[PDB]
């Protein structure tokens, strides 16, 4: 809750000035962070899912919700009901502490990190990014793992416009460009 403490005193004072909001409730705020691993190759065996869910449980310290197919499609050879991915929703204090560890540790540990995109805000403020490799988090031991996974991070916020979420992450020095 270090950044949550950092949110409540200086980010709110910053955004109220540069947007001239009438109320303090009118400010944006982050709401949840969703950690998906679409593991489409787990239809061969459960153990790839069972270890990828084990890896994402180490990144964010929650047991992941194993997601399933909403319907059946034949291009991917899946039926409605097959376990096909895993997610973690992060809210409250656990949202901020992962968000602290993300932009301070794991984003510098990206190989050939050169910035993010400012064109990834889904028209309505909600930001989504995808990492290539789970080794950028220091939770994963390099010798103990064998397979390079990938996950994607989705920050869902209360910003109405598209730029207001872009200004919100910039108050947390989110490395756009």
């Amino acid at each position: 809750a270090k950044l949550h403490d950092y949110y409540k005193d200086e980010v709110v004072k910053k955004l109220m000035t540069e947007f001239n909001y009438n109320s303090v409730m009118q400010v944006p705020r982050v709401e949840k962070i969703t950690l998906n691993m679409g593991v489409g190759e787990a239809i061969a065996d459960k153990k790839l899912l069972d270890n990828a869910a084990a890896d994402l449980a180490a990144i964010s310290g929650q047991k992941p919700l194993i997601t399933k197919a909403r319907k059946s499609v034949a291009g991917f050879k899946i039926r409605q009901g097959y376990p096909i991915g895993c997610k973690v929703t992060l809210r409250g204090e656990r949202m901020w502490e992962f968000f602290e560890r993300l932009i301070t540790i794991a984003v510098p540990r990206i190989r050939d990190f050169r910035g993010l995109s400012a064109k990834s805000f889904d028209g309505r403020g909600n930001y989504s990014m995808g990492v290539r490799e789970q080794i950028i988090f220091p939770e994963i031991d390099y010798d103990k793992v064998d397979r390079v996974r990938g996950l994607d991070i989705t920050i869902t916020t209360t910003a109405k416009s598209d730029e207001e979420g872009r200004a919100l992450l910039a108050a947390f020095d989110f490395p756009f460009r």
Binding site: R111, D112, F113, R114, I135, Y142
Partner: protein, 116 residues
């Protein structure tokens, strides 16, 4: 054991395990360890973390993993955009340096393409 972005094996010796970095070889690995004062026969194991901090600074003097692949691709795409003879060889998939294309161009042309 994590230099310039990538990891480096511990069981190998010092000069060999440095060469896993895209941008250094057996020559430049001797140049790194001489400037760090580190013997070459030691492993990446039993190194002080201050020595590895000395090691990261010496590698950071040169052009490595993320920079070099960008520079190599920039040089090739410079030839691509001009349309010189070296650019056409780079984009026909043919050898650039003036080798024979009648026989034994299999590195640039891949495996054999049978006439169907």
């Amino acid at each position: 054991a994590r230099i310039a972005g990538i990891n480096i094996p511990d069981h190998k010796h010092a000069v060999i395990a440095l060469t896993s970095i895209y941008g250094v070889g057996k020559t430049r690995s001797k140049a790194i360890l001489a400037a760090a004062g580190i013997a070459e026969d030691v492993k990446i194991s039993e190194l002080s973390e201050g020595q590895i901090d000395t090691l990261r600074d010496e590698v950071a003097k040169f052009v490595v993993e993320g920079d070099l692949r960008r520079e190599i691709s920039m040089s090739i795409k410079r030839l691509m955009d001009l349309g010189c003879y070296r650019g056409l060889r780079h984009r026909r998939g043919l050898p650039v340096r003036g080798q024979r294309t009648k026989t034994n161009a299999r590195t640039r042309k891949g495996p054999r393409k049978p006439i169907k």
